[PDB]
Structure formats: structure tokens, C-alpha cells
């Protein structure tokens, strides 16, 4: 019923050894099949190491005065709006991280060239100062 990667009633719940939560058969089987890891915790895990239990997990909270309109409408627009804001925020965050990473690589290579030229000039002036006395 309550799960991190599901949040619904799963048909065949599957839990990871690092983090125990109800997971779908295709999500944990395909996700762990392509690359072995835990979907919710991003921890290393194996397909054969998945825990097998029948309807076993924790629960979650919820306010009172539960009705159909807040659930359907408020929960649909709230969950869809939160997932959309998380996907778009992750898109702009990954794009800005890619641009800032490109500028960081340019400053790393260029700063390495300036540090190499300045280090070679400092070593040349030091050797000239050492051999200049005789």
C-alpha cells in the first residue's frame, strides 16, 4: 500500500537488501537487471539479493477529513505538479550543471596550462639565478 517507489498496491512487491520498500516487478527486475542497484536508495544491490515478502512494508501518515475531491483533484494536481516540478527542476539543474562543468573543465585545462607555463618560468628563473653567480 505505502511504498517509496510505488505508493500504491503492488502486484508483486520486491524489496532491496540495502533499503526495504515495496517495488514493482518490472521496475526492480528491469532496473536491477540493466544495472544492479537499489532504485530508491541508489545503493548497490543484486537481483538475487532482493527480499521476498508477502504484503510487508511500513505505512505513511495522512491528515483527517479524507474525501474524494481532495484525493482525486488535490492529490492528482499535487502529485503531478510535484513530479513535473521535480523533473523540470532536475532538467534545468542538470543542464546548468553541464554548463558549469564545461566552464570548470575550461578553467581546469587553461589553469593547468597557465600553471605549467608559470611553473616552467619560475624554474627557469630559479636555474638562471642559481647558475648566474659564477
Amino acid at each position: 500500500l505505502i511504498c517509496s517507489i510505488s505508493n500504491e498496491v503492488p502486484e508483486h512487491p520486491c524489496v532491496s537488501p540495502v533499503s526495504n520498500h515495496v517495488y514493482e516487478r518490472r521496475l526492480i527486475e528491469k532496473y536491477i537487471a540493466e544495472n544492479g542497484t537499489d532504485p530508491i536508495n541508489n545503493q548497490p544491490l543484486s537481483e538475487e539479493q532482493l527480499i521476498d515478502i508477502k504484503v510487508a512494508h511500513p505505512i505513511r501518515p495522512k491528515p483527517p477529513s479524507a474525501t474524494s475531491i481532495p484525493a482525486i483533484l488535490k492529490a492528482l494536481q499535487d502529485e503531478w505538479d510535484a513530479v513535473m516540478l521535480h523533473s523540470f527542476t532536475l532538467r534545468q539543474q542538470l543542464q546548468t550543471t553541464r554548463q558549469e562543468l564545461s566552464h570548470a573543465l575550461y578553467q581546469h585545462d587553461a589553469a593547468c596550462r597557465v600553471i605549467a607555463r608559470l611553473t616552467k618560468e619560475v624554474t627557469a628563473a630559479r636555474e638562471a639565478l642559481a647558475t648566474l653567480k659564477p
Binding site: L90, L94, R98, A104, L105, D109, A111
Partner: protein
């Protein structure tokens, strides 16, 4: 290739600020392609390959767009 931030205490933040970014701005002004960063962030991206379907596309379009005999006894009895 060994420079410690605590090795030379006289120059750290002002030590390389203007001139360092001026030479780096000279190399970047010469050329600034992208290889390691774009290739590193290219495979994971953000959301690209999976993209899901259905409510992912409808929720994306909704993200880019911020926008009677029985009927009485039906809604009434339901109320």
C-alpha cells in the same frame, strides 16, 4: 604539480583572482569546445532515454501550460 593552499599564505583568494581568470579567459577566448564535461553529463542527462509515457507527456504539456431527472438525485444522493 604540488601547490598547497596553505603552502603560500600571502596569496590565496586575491592571489589568483583576476590574472588567473584572464589567462584562462585567453585560452577560453582562443577556443572553448566541450569534451569531458559534455561527455560525462551526456549519458545520464536529466530525463532523456526513459521519458516514460502517458502522464509523463501529458504532465509535461501541463507543466509548460500553467492552466435532468437523475442528476438531482445522483449528486444529491452522493452528497
Amino acid at each position: 604539480v604540488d601547490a598547497l593552499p596553505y603552502f603560500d599564505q600571502g596569496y590565496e583568494a586575491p592571489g589568483v583572482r583576476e590574472a588567473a581568470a584572464a589567462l584562462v579567459e585567453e585560452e577560453t577566448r582562443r577556443y572553448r569546445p566541450t569534451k569531458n564535461y559534455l561527455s560525462y553529463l551526456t549519458a545520464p542527462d536529466y530525463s532523456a532515454f526513459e521519458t516514460d509515457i502517458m502522464r509523463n507527456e501529458f504532465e509535461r504539456l501541463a507543466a509548460r501550460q500553467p492552466i435532468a431527472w437523475q442528476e438531482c438525485v445522483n449528486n444529491s444522493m452522493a452528497q
